[PDB]
Structures are given as C-alpha cells and as structure tokens.
From a paper:
Previous structural analysis of the K+-occluded E2-P transition state of H+,K+-ATPase showed a single bound K+ at cation-binding site II, in marked contrast to the two K+ ions occluded at sites I and II of the closely-related Na+,K+-ATPase which mediates electrogenic 3Na+/2K+ translocation across the membrane. One of the notable differences between HKA and NKA is the presence of Lys791 and its salt bridge partner Glu820 in HKA, which physically restrict K+-binding space at the site I position.
Changing Glu936 to valine would destroy the hydrogen bond and possibly reorient Asp824 and therefore Lys791Ser. In the structure of the quadruple mutant Lys791Ser/Glu820Asp/Tyr340Asn/Glu936Val (KS/ED/YN/EV), analyzed at 3.2 Å resolution, the side chain of Asp824 does indeed face Lys791Ser due to the loss of the hydrogen bond with Glu936Val in TM8,; however, the distance between Lys791Ser and Asp824 is 4.7 Å, still insufficient for the desired strong linking hydrogen bond. Consequently, the position of Lys791Ser remains different from that of Ser783 in NKA, disrupting K+ binding site I. Nevertheless, the anomalous difference Fourier map from bound Rb+ in the quadruple mutant shows a spread density distributed around site II and it is elongated towards site I, significantly different from the spherical density observed in the wild type4 and other HKA mutants. In marked contrast, only in the quadruple mutant, is Rb+ density at the cation-binding site significantly stronger than that at the P-domain at higher contour levels. Assuming single Rb+-binding at the P-domain as observed in most of P2-type ATPases, the observed stronger Rb+ anomalous signal at the cation-binding site strongly suggests that more than one Rb+ is bound to the cation-binding site. However, when we modeled two Rb+ ions according to the anomalous density distribution, the two Rb+ ions came very close to each other (2.7 Å), and the one on the site I side showed a very high temperature factor (B-factor = 170) after iterative refinement. Therefore, although the observed strong Rb+ density in the quadruple mutant suggests the binding of more than one Rb+ ion at the cation-binding site, the second Rb+ is unlikely to be well-coordinated at site I, in stark contrast to NKA, where the two K+ ions are 4.1 Å apart. Consequently, we conclude that the crystal structure of the HKA quadruple mutant is obtained as a mixture of one Rb+- and two Rb+-bound protein molecules in the crystal lattice.
Residue numbers in the entry:
A (entry chain A): 49 to 1033
B (entry chain B): 30 to 290
C-alpha cells in the first residue's frame, strides 16, 4: 500500500498499464475484471441453513437435555436385557427432552430470520456508479466493473468508487468518516502528505463521499484490498465472546448436574446396601440424574427472552440473538465512537455573531433546543445574505423528509446554510427566486469570495443587492462599515478587533467560521440593466458593509447528552473511542457528558497552575485524552493503570485495531463491555464486545453486520431502555428458574421412596411430563411480566464473579425447603387416597413387589378385600393424579411467593400481574380437564379424582405463602447478616 | 464448601429443625387420617365395582395362564396338584374350625358382632364340597386321567351383594371352538356350580377373621388330547360383569390348556 501513492505518474502508468490522460483500454479492463474479480466487498462465503438450525440445537441446557436423553435411551437397554414392563416411559421422557430442544431451536432460528430481514428492509439496493475514462472517453459504469488502474473522475456528491490515488484535483474535499472518525472534511491533493495511506492526501477511499470539488485519479486498489476491505476482513478474524447470560446458564447446568450426580451416587450406594442388583441400582442412579434435569426450563427462558425482544423492537431496537436482550444490563463499561454514533455527522450551523453578540443556535434534529434572537434588523439582513448567496438546492420530492435528513446538492459549507435558511425562514429556494442573480463569482482564489449581485423584490428599489460570502478575514479586508442595532456604523479599530475576537472565539471551539458582507447599489450609477464584468472590474469589490458571522460544526445527537447521563447514573462507565483529532473529541465529550463539568486533564492543571505537566501529579486528574501515537507506545500495565487512575477517558486518533485493544483490555480486567458504533472503523471492535450496538441508518453495513443490536431510528436513547429491561429479565429470570427448580424434589422423592420403602409408585413419568411441559410453563413465563423491586436503573452494575443468576442459596432453598414441603403434601395425599380405598400406610410399605406382580390377581388389602392388577393399576393412577394436583396446587402458592424476593405480595399487589393470574386460572383448568375428561384414564394416566384430595394439599400451600412472607419480612424489616447470608435467594 | 465451619453448625441445625417441624406436621396428618377410617367398612372402595375371578392351578409361562402337561409323566402335573393341595390346606375341616356350619341358603346378614374379642361369625367351606376335585379319592385332582379339576374363586368386596335371585354359577366353556369338536363338557363340584348365597356380604378381616371364600371346581371331561385349547370360565350373576377389556379377570378367567398323552 505504501509504494502506490509515493510513485510518480510515470511509474504508476507502467505498473497498471494505463494512462493518466487516456485511461485503460476496453480490452485490458475486461481482462483485469476476470483476474481480480469485481470491485465489490466479498460477502461471507458460507451460509448453510442446516448448519444454521444445528447451531440452535447446541447450548448448555441443551447439552444437559441431550446427555440426559442419551442416559434415558441407555436405560432402555439396561432395562431390555432384564425384560421389564410399561418401560415405554423412558422413551416418552427422552423423546420429550429432544423435542423441547428441537422446537426451541426452531423458534430461535425463526426469530433470527425475522430480525435479519428487518435489518435488510432499510438497506440501499441502488447501485452506486462511477465516471470512468476508458480509451479516452468518459462514460458512466457500475462501480463493480472498475478494475485496478482505471482512470476515475470524482465530482461533488459522488461516492468514491474505489481506492484511488489522486492525479489531479481542484479543491477536492472528501468525508473519510467511515475509515477515520474525522468529522472535519478532509482535503485531497495530488501530492504526498504522509506515507501511512490513512493520513496521506493523494488517496481517496472506497466508501467515502466527495463532499465538495472535482478530482481525477488512478484506481490503486479494488475490492477487499481497499482499506475498507482489510478492516472489514480483520473484523472476520476477531471471534465473538460468549454472552454473559450464556456463562450463567452454563454455571446453572453445572449446579443441577453436580447435584444430580451427588443425589444419584448417594442412592446408588444406598440401593446396593439395601440389596438391589448392581444393574438395577445403576438404572436408578440414571433415573435420579434425569430427574434433576428440567424438561421445560429452556422453553420458558426462550419465551421470556423473546418477550423482552418484542418490547425493544417496539422501541425501534432490533436484536439478532435472543441472548442480547439481557447483555446490556450486565454491562459495566460502554465504549462509544464520537462521529455518527454520538454526533450527527452533519455540519449544521451552531453559532453566529451579529449586533456584537455571539448567538447560539439549535443544533438538534427534533428542534428541541432553544433558537436565538430572530427579531433584530441585523438578523433579517444576515438571513438574506446567507439565503441568497447559496447556489445549493435540495433534491426533488423531499418535502416530507425532515429538513436535516434531506439530501442537498452543494458544498459542505453551503448545505448547512441552506438547511438553516429553510428551518429559520422557510421556502429558502422560493425566497431566493424573488431576487434574480445578475452576476456571480463563486470560487476563485484571487478574490476568495462568492459574489452575487441580485435585484431587490420591490420595483420601488431599482437598487441592487450585492451579497458575498467567504472567509471572515477575506471579507473584512473588503468591507468598510458594520451593521449594528439598526445602523451602519463605521469599522473602528474596536469593531475590527471585536470581529477578530469573535472569529478567534468561534474558531477555538473547532467550528467553520464564515463571514458575510453586503452592499446596496445605486439606481443612477448602476441603472436597471447594468452590464457587469469580471476581467476588468466594473462592480465594487471593496467598501462593503459587514452583516455577521455564521459558524458550523459537527453537532451532538439529540438524545445522547441525556442518554449517557442516565447510563452513568446506573454505574456504567462511559468511555469514548474516536479516530478524530483530540480537540474535537474533548469538545464532544464535554458536551455529551463523558467528561464531567469541572473535570480537567493533566494538561489543563498545567495551565491552571502554569506548571510543567511533569510536576503535576497524575492522581489529581480525573480525565485524560490519549492519542493513537501514544497508545501504540503503551504496554498493558500502562493501560490498566491509566484506565483506573483517570475515571473519565477519551481516546483520540485511534485505529480499527486500537479500539479492539481497548475493548480487550477492559474485558480482561473483568468488565462486560458494550460498543456503540457506526462505520467500518467499528466493525473490528463490535464483534469482540459482549454487545455491539449499531446505528441502523448512519451505520455502515460492516458495523451493522458485526453487531448484535441495531437501532433502526438511530435513537441513542434506546440504550437506556436496553439496560433496564435487560436488568429486569435477569432479576425476573432468577425468579422464574427458581420456581421451576422447586419441582425436582416433589417429583424425585416419590420415586426415591418408591425404591427406598417399596411403596406403590406415587408419580409416573407421563405425569411428571405433564407437570413440567404443560402446567409449569405459563406461570414461569408470567413471572417475567413483573415490575421492578427497586430503582433498578440506579443500582450499580452487577458483579460478574459474586452476583450470579443461579447460586447455591437459590437452588438449596427451592429444593430442600419448598420442594420438601411439596413432597410432604404429595405423601399425605398419597397415603390418604390409598387408605380411603383400602391401603393403610403400614401395608403400603414393601407392597410394590406384589403391587406390580402381573401374576397376583388376588392381592388383599388392609380391609381384606382382593384386587386384580387392573383395579390397583387404576388406583396407582389415582396416586399419580393426586400427586399431580398436590404439586400444581402447592405451586399456585409458589408463583405468588416468587413474584417478589424482598418485598411482600401485599405491597406489590396480588393481582397486579395480570398474566400471572391468567396462568394460575389456566393451571387449575388444565388440571380439571385432564382429570375429568372421558378417556384420560388410558390415553394418559389421569382419572376422575374425589374432591376431598384437592383440599388436602391446600394447608401446605398456605404454609408456603406464610413461610416465604415471613422469610421476606425477615430480610426487609431486619436487613441483618444472618438472614441475608443464609435465607435470601 | 467449607465457607465457615462454625456457621455450618447453625445452618445444619436450621435444616434439621425445618425437617422435623414438617415431619411432625406429616405425622399428625397421618394420625388424624387414620382416626377418620372405619376398620370394618371401606371408606370409598371406588375401583372394586365388580369382582375378580381367580383360578387354581395358576401357571403363567407368558401372555397369561398356560397349563400344559403329560399324563404319563408325574413330573408334569405333580406341581399343579400340589399347588391345589397346599391351597386347600386352609380349606381343611379342622382348619376352618373358627367359622360356623352354615345352613341358611339365602343369605348371612349380621349387624352385630357375636364372637370372641368383638369379632363376627363367619361361614364355613371345607374341601369336601369339591367332592371329586379333592385329595379324596384322587390326590391328582383329575390331572392323571385327562379330566383336570380347576378351582374357581371369587374376590371378596366388603358388603357386596351379587344378586339375590339365584346363586352365582361358573359356566366354563371353550373360547372360539364352534367346530365339529363338541362343547366343553364340565362336571362342577358343588353341583350346578353355585357359590352359595350365605358367603355374602363380606364384612372385613377384622370383623370376620376366619372367613374363607367359597370355591367351585370344574372337572373338564371333554378336553381333547394333544391339542392346545383355550377355556373361559365366566361367573354369571347380576352384579358380576365379564366385559371389561382393561381387566381380563373380571367375572371371568381364561386359560390355555394342553393335555398330552
Ligand atoms: C422422578 C421420577 N422418575 C421416574 C421414573 C419412572 C417412574 C417414576 N418416576 C419419577 C417419579 C420410571 O418410568 C423409570 O424408572 C424412569 C427412568 C428410568 C431410567 C432412567 C431415567 C428415568 N423414571
Ligand atoms: C354341621 O352341623 C353339625 C350339627 O348338625 C355339627 O356337627 C357341625 O357344626 C357341622 N358338621 C360337622 C361334621 O362338623
Ligand atoms: C365323581 O365321583 C363319583 C364317585 O366318587 C363318580 O361316580 C363319578 O363318576 C365322578 N364323576 C366324574 C365326572 O368323574
Ligand atoms: C408324554 O410322555 C411320554 C412318556 O413320558 C412320551 O413317550 C410321550 O411322547 C409324551 N407325549 C408327547 C405328546 O410328547
Ligand atoms: Mg462513523
Ligand atoms: Rb429388599
Ligand atoms: Rb424433572
Ligand atoms: Rb440559544
Ligand atoms: Rb459481538
């Protein structure tokens, strides 16, 4: 790349077999097109859709659900050697496990397809073109047809077609705001300025836009060999990290798996001691390890994550993975690109100087801010000089698009002036067409002014307006009076000096100061119809009357200055990463709030104190601006110390890779980093981030493709929604998972006892399946429609290593306390239903052999009555159908108690969550349908049940409510160490 | 996890306390449950709608009762006969001694307990009623002559009445054998196959400790030799149903029989 802008035209036109005058040949240019391929970025070469659904099938919970299904099928072999009966339960359980993983994967694939298509519903499929000189002729072709060495002509308003070396140019200015963050329009000259082609001036870049001027050059690189291409392809090398929620789900599948292995090993050893054969004791070990696995928790988690993505979509924020919906609530540091993401990347007029006042304007797009004084006599003249002396014009049919977003045909300087006249005055072009243009001299260095002589509106004035605009010091050397407070006062040394003190004040803010002067021409010296001339001046090029100054800059976006504030009030550290020069960075960091008011760098303390920066101690500075040249000289230890030592940080003149280094360092130190971005300079550092947000309109396709979140409206306020909802689901999933976890023990303990005491089987697999995959989905999903238990948006960011989604207190509580109460409810109802129909609890002990024997059709009960296999099979089904209702009625309490973790249900409100109550009703309705529908006795294992056993568990449910209310009042009333350490989940 | 050894004791005490609290609740619940249970009468007895029918000798190789034997080999029917005999060792004259000689043909209704230790009186059944299908004079119960004696018993349901009009009778007959082969010729002992109506109602083991179910026997005379046959023994009574497809042993017992000579 270095030895292509340093060459001479003689050596270049031999390298590429072209001419700087005549261009490529029609033949060679069609050969190079088949050699080097099209001048287009290479899309990802791999998109197989089957390997797209396969990825959805893989996850931590999915891995457990997969290994447990394999365990079930291996059990269906250990239990096929010894021929057993009703063994098809294992097949149902394993098939349901695999079915859940499959259908949740299908959901995920569908809702990623939807997102990608939406993100492509805003993309521009209009071919970008170029003007090519081939065989000596200038014609217009598609940019994908250009080949290395072709002669290209660039005009104002034309996107640069390739990576070009400037051979000749007249005042050409391009917007390298994708490669660099350079808001300030950059000049392109045919002469070598640097050798890093990023900072030299003889090179134009692939996806940059020619703001103003005219140029002619040689294509030095096409395709993925352009600077664009190598940055976007480096972005392919970086590999996205696991989302935080994925790490926490993996820690959860560590907890449940370790608990399963402990449980199964304990009861395998116990079974060998009891006298069971090694093979059958190991089948029971397998049964325990499957019982710890949750069949439906993946479904409810996926549904919750989808319901908090629909919300964000309605706030014009689309997520690619369902996992991104949480990631912004765990974030501790936000890294943001200055241009485009934080600013508007649109030169608008910011300030003015007239009537000896520095007026300030509304730089916003919503026009929310406060405008200036628009009543002075001077303002109307200024709004005439700026309106008339503007050869720019809006494109056709944009009268519904907002004025800032409209496409204008004109210079960077003139476009802002035209939009200013449109907003302040309205119908700027129509107003300009009330004053014809007799003569004009727009762009000459000798005169340095845009002169336009117009004729006044009324024929009452044959007088002629002379409006001219240009650099203020080129204006004042040609003016003699100043318009102040309804008067034409003369230009004393004082007025000249005040003009200078305004030029040098509005230009110290990093703004484009432009000066405007005007004069009224006589009806006698210049009667209507004067024939003006330029070569021999016949009009006044001197003795004009100053109107005012107008200054333009790249302004901050509307909602950004408040968005970063509400982020910072949540403990999030906002850091800026820009490629623009340091002064602009500090300005748009103070404005938006990254740098607090009253904060000063080590270089500012050295001006307050007039001390060498060396002696100023660093710890006394809370801000710092670090350039790329001195970020490349800095080792890891220096970065960690400088990052913590100065809390508010602005990184300047960074590169694609330096941003990646910053993100990597923060992540290594133990932070969850989020990158907000636009343009190809952020595609590297948007992948490595835990969440990459891209502007959906102003962002380049590379940064919108290497992202996880797309803001379709470019509203930077959506970030401060993504945190709170993202926080809520964490706290609202910690609840949901908790509820579901409780169901393991009231299901396991039946079976654990069916072998330990040899009682008839209380609960069967076809019924635990109905508990997990039908009755307990609506409750847990409803638990995410809850509301905040604190000012979640003021809480400091969650600590990754201490604060976890599932911790040992949560699982231990949900199992050993609550699920133990549920197991007792089931056992009471089991012994009760059996005793009412003839089997007292003592006889139930050890009865399973004869209960399950197919050869005993005369088994006699506690009353001495003799039962066949079918009669007591139906009664076993009754034990099933009462343990079923025991669990569901003891979990109608669970959903309510888990709707809060610290506050009581009375305060929040029992019925405040609507979906929760709908789910409670649906739970009881599915129970009644399953028990009392004709045929369910043999379709499934549910039968009509007496109405006394519905109420045996209700005491237990109210015990659950009482226990959780007391253990929640224990934490809130007494925020003591004992309760919070031992009894808080 | 060893977070703190001293704190471990306090939370261990909390967990043992929680479990013993709920264990006391559970124990109280089972005891109040058992105090709500009458010991002579089942509280609900829902699934005991119609009675089960059980057969001796009971031999299931697979897929139900399959009794196949050779008359010329004592080892093929000795176990069958011994199961019959050890079954009837409690239907013995001096082992059924705790009951009373029952001569009331219509019924045995008893509303008050008139036996030692607040027990009730029970009806009697000895092996003699099975005149030919007893150890007297054939200790093979008909199996050595190719005329086997299969004894049919009905399951007992507390205060269950099977119909007053006549007595329940076992019709044993060939299942799907309408061929030129003749109907199963059976001689039932007691004659006419009647379970006498004074063995109903059953009032529970606490009420009638010495109660023994009535029995009927079928001497299968017509059974062909070296042919696998299938026989259905149905009990015909008002309150007895034999059409249940989820209990093939409701009011009927079906068995496969092969006598090989
Ligand atoms: C929690 C629980 N698990 C079972 C269960 C059965 C019955 C009741 N069960 C209960 C209440 C049988 O169908 C099977 O042994 C089945 C099984 C077998 C091997 C491996 C995994 C599962 N597991
Ligand atoms: C039947 O009654 C007689 C009296 O008629 C009595 O000896 C006994 O209870 C029964 N018979 C025998 C032989 O035991
Ligand atoms: C039953 O026994 C009697 C005498 O013991 C005998 O006369 C009669 O033939 C026997 N019936 C059958 C079917 O063998
Ligand atoms: C029955 O047993 C005898 C001797 O044990 C044997 O010879 C005969 O073949 C057997 N009958 C059949 C059908 O095998
Ligand atoms: Mg940008
Ligand atoms: Rb045992
Ligand atoms: Rb489970
Ligand atoms: Rb203002
Ligand atoms: Rb990413």
């Amino acid at each position: 790349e270095i030895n292509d802008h340093q060459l001479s035209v003689a050596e270049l036109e031999q390298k590429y077999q072209t001419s700087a005058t005549k261009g490529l040949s029609a033949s060679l240019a069609a050969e190079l097109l088949l050699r080097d391929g099209p001048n287009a970025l290479r899309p990802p070469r791999g998109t197989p859709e089957y390997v797209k659904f396969a990825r959805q099938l893989a996850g931590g919970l999915q891995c457990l659900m997969w290994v447990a299904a394999a365990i079930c099928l291996i059990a269906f072999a250990i239990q096929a050697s010894e021929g057993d009966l009703t063994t098809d339960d294992n097949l149902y359980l394993a098939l349901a496990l695999i079915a859940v993983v499959v259908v949740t994967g299908c959901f995920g694939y569908y809702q990623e397809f939807k997102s990608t298509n939406i993100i492509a519903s805003f993309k521009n499929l209009v071919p970008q073109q170029a003007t090519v000189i081939r065989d000596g002729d200038k014609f217009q072709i598609n940019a994908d047809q250009l080949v290395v060495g072709d002669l290209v002509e660039m005009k104002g308003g034309d996107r640069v077609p390739a990576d070009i070396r400037i051979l000749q140019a007249q005042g050409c200015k391009v917007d390298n705001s994708s490669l660099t963050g350079e808001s300030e329009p950059q000049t392109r000259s045919p002469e070598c300025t640097h050798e890093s082609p990023l900072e030299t001036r003889n090179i134009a870049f692939f996806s940059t836009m020619c703001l103003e001027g005219t140029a002619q050059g040689l294509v030095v690189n096409t395709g993925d060999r352009t600077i664009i291409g190598r940055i976007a392809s480096l972005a392919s090398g970086v590999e996205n990290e696991k989302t935080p929620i994925a790490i926490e789900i993996e820690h959860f599948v560590d907890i449940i798996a370790g608990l399963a292995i402990l449980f199964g090993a304990t009861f395998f050893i116990v079974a060998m001691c009891i006298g069971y054969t090694f093979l059958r004791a190991m089948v029971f070990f397998m049964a325990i390890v499957v019982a710890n696995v949750p069949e439906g928790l993946l479904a409810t988690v996926t549904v919750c994550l989808s319901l908090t993505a629909k919300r964000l979509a309605s706030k014009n924020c689309v997520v690619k993975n369902l996992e991104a919906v949480e990631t912004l609530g765990s974030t501790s540091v936000i890294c943001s690109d200055k241009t485009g993401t934080l600013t508007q990347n649109r030169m608008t007029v910011s300030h003015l100087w007239f009537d000896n006042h520095i007026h300030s304007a509304d730089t916003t797009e919503d026009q929310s801010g406060q405008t200036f004084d628009q009543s002075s006599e001077t303002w109307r003249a200024l709004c005439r000089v700026l309106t008339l002396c503007n050869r720019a014009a809006f494109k056709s049919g944009q009268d519904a698009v907002p004025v800032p977003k409209r496409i204008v045909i004109g210079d960077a300087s003139e476009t802002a002036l035209l939009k200013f006249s449109e907003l302040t005055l309205g119908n700027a072009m129509g107003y300009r067409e009330r004053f014809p243009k007799v003569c004009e001299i727009p762009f000459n260095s000798t005169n340095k002014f845009q002169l336009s002589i117009h004729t006044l509106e009324d024929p009452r004035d044959p007088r002629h307006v002379l409006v001219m605009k240009g650099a203020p010091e080129r204006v004042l050397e040609r003016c003699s009076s100043i318009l102040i407070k309804g008067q034409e006062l003369p230009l004393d040394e004082q007025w000249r000096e005040a003009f200078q003190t305004a030029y040098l004040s509005l230009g110290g803010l990093g703004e484009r100061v432009l000066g405007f002067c005007q004069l009224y021409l006589s009806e006698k010296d210049y009667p209507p119809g004067y024939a003006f001339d330029v070569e021999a001046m016949n009009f006044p090029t001197s003795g004009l009357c100053f109107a005012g100054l107008v200054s333009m800059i790249d302004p901050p976006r509307a909602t950004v200055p408040d968005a970063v504030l509400k982020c910072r009030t949540a403990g999030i550290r906002v850091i800026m990463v820009t490629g623009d020069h340091p002064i602009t960075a500090k300005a748009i960091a103070a404005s938006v709030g990254i740098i607090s008011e009253g904060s000063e760098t080590v270089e500012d303390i050295a001006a307050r104190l007039r001390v060498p920066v060396d002696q100023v101690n660093r710890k006394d500075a809370r801000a710092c601006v670090i350039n790329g040249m001195q970020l490349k000289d800095m080792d890891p230890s220096e970065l960690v110390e400088a990052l913590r030592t100065h809390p508010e940080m602005v990184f300047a003149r960074t590169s694609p890779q330096q941003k990646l280094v910053i993100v990597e360092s923060c992540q290594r130190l133990g932070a969850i980093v989020a990158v907000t971005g636009d343009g190809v300079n952020d595609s590297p550092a948007l992948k490595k981030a835990d969440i990459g947000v891209a502007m959906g309109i102003a962002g380049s396709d590379a940064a919108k493709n290497a992202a996880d979140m797309i803001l379709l409206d470019d509203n930077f306020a959506s970030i401060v929604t993504g945190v709170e909802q993202g926080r809520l689901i964490f706290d609202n999933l910690k609840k949901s998972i908790a509820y579901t976890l409780t169901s393991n023990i009231p299901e396991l303990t039946p079976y654990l006892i069916y072998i330990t005491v040899s009682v008839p089987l209380p609960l069967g697999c076809i019924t635990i399946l109905f508990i997990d995959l039908c009755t307990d989905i609506f409750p847990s999903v409803s638990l995410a429609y809850e509301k905040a238990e604190s000012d979640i948006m003021h809480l400091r960011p969650r600590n990754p290593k201490r604060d976890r989604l599932v911790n040992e207190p949560l699982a231990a509580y949900s199992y050993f306390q609550i699920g133990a109460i549920q197991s007792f409810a089931g056992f009471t109802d089991y012994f009760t239903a059996m005793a009412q129909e003839g089997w007292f609890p003592l006889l139930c002990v050890g009865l399973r052999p004869q209960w399950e024997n197919h050869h005993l059709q005369d088994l006699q009960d506690s009353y001495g009555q003799e039962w066949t296999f079918g009669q007591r099979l139906y009664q076993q089904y009754t034990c099933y159908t009462v343990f079923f209702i025991s669990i569901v009625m003891c979990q109608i309490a669970d959903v309510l108690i888990r709707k809060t973790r610290r506050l009581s249900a009375f305060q929040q409100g029992f019925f405040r969550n609507r979906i929760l109550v709908i789910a409670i009703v649906f739970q009881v309705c599915i129970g009644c349908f399953l028990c009392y529908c004709p045929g369910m006795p043999n379709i499934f294992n549910f039968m009509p049940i007496r109405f006394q056993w519905w109420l045996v568990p209700m005491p237990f449910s109210l015990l659950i409510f009482v226990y959780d209310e007391i253990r929640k009042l224990g934490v809130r009333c007494c925020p003591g160490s004992w309760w919070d350490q031992e009894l808080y989940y | 996890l060893g977070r703190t050894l001293s704190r471990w004791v306090w939370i261990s005490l909390y967990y043992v306390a929680f479990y013993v609290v709920m264990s006391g609740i559970f124990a109280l619940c089972i005891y109040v449950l058992m105090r709500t249970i009458d010991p002579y009468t089942p509280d609900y007895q829902d699934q005991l709608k119609s009675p089960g029918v059980t057969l001796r000798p009971d031999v299931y190789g697979e897929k139900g009762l399959d009794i196949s034997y050779n008359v010329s080999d004592s080892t093929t029917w000795a176990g069958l006969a011994h199961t019959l005999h050890r079954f009837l060792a409690g239907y013995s004259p001096a082992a059924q001694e705790g009951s009373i000689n029952c001569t009331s043909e219509k019924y045995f209704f008893q509303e008050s307990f008139l036996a030692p230790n607040h027990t009730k009186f029970s009806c009697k059944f000895t092996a003699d009623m099975l005149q030919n299908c007893s150890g007297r004079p054939d200790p093979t119960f008909g199996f050595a002559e190719g005329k086997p004696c299969f004894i049919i018993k009905m399951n007992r349901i507390v205060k269950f009445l099977p119909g007053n009009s006549t007595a329940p009778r076992v019709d044993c007959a060939f299942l799907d054998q309408p061929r030129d082969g003749p109907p199963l010729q059976v001689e039932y002992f007691p004659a006419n196959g009647t379970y006498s109506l004074h063995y109903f109602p059953y009032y529970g083991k606490k009420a009638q400790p010495h109660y023994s179910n009535p029995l009927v026997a079928a001497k299968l005379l017509n059974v062909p030799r070296n042919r696998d046959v299938v026989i259905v023994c149905k009990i015909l009574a008002e309150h007895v149903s034999f059409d249940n497809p989820h209990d093939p042993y409701e009011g009927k017992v079906e068995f496969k029989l092969k006598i090989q000579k």
